[PDB]
Amino acid sequence: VNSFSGYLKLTDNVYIKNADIVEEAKKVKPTVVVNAANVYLKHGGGVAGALNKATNNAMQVESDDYIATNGPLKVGGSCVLSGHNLAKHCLHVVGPNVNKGEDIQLLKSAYENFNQHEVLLAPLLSAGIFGADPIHSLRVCVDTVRTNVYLAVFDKNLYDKLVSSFL
Ligand SMILES: O=C(Nc1ccc(C(=O)N[C@@H]2c3cccc(O)c3C[C@@H]2C(=O)O)c2scnc12)NC1CC1
C-alpha cells in the first residue's frame, strides 16, 4: 500500500492522474519524483521549470554543481539528485526533444531509467515542450517500465484523451 490517491490504474504497474506534478509531490513526498530534464540540467520551463521554481531555485543550484563536476547527461540518460522539499530524490531523466531533432527511439532508453526505482511519481517523458506525441510516450512507458509508476498529466484535456485512447 502507498499514499498515491485518485489514480486510474492502466496496467499492473502504471497509474495515471490529471494533476500538477508539483502539487502532487508536495502532498505525497514520494521517494522519487522524475524531472523532465535536459542534458545541461537547465530547468527553464515545462515540468523542469515548475519543479525548480517550487524548490526556490535550489534544484538549479545543485544541478549546476553536478554539471560542473560531471559534464552533461546523455539523451536517454539520468542522474539522481536531491528531491529538496518535493521528494526524497529527484531522478532527472532526459527524454529526446523533438524540437531539437533528437531520435525518438531514445524514448525507450529514457524510460528504462525508471526501472532502477521501485516506485516513482513522473511526467510523460518527451511530452509538452519536448515535442513528442504524449499518446506514444504513454505507450512506451507502459511497454518499458516494470516498476510502479504514478503519472501526473497537467492538462485535463490531454489526460482525458490519454485515458480514452489507451489500449
Ligand atoms: O506546471 C506545473 N506542473 C507541470 C508542468 C508541466 C507539465 C508538462 O510538461 N505537461 C505536458 C504538457 C504541457 C502542455 C501541453 C501538453 O500537451 C502537455 C503534455 C503533458 C501534460 O499535459 O501533462 C506537467 S505534468 C504534471 N505537472 C506538470 N505546476 C505549476 C503550478 C503550475
Curated annotation (Swiss-Prot):
Known regulation of activity: Inhibited in vitro by GRL-0617.
Subcellular location as annotated: Host endoplasmic reticulum membrane
Catalytic activity from the UniProt record: Thiol-dependent hydrolysis of ester, thioester, amide, peptide and isopeptide bonds formed by the C-terminal Gly of ubiquitin (a 76-residue protein attached to proteins as an intracellular targeting signal)
Domain Macro: 1-167
Membrane topology of this protein: Multi-pass membrane protein
Function as written in the Swiss-Prot or TrEMBL entry: Responsible for the cleavages located at the N-terminus of the replicase polyprotein. Participates together with nsp4 in the assembly of virally-induced cytoplasmic double-membrane vesicles necessary for viral replication. Antagonizes innate immune induction of type I interferon by blocking the phosphorylation, dimerization and subsequent nuclear translocation of host IRF3. Also prevents host NF-kappa-B signaling. In addition, PL-PRO possesses a deubiquitinating/deISGylating activity and processes both 'Lys-48'- and 'Lys-63'-linked polyubiquitin chains from cellular substrates.
SUBUNIT field: May form homohexamers. Interacts with N protein.
Protein name, as recorded: Papain-like protease nsp3
Taxonomic placement: Viruses, Riboviria, Orthornavirae, Pisuviricota, Pisoniviricetes
Full-sequence portion shown in this chain: 1025 to 1191 of 7096
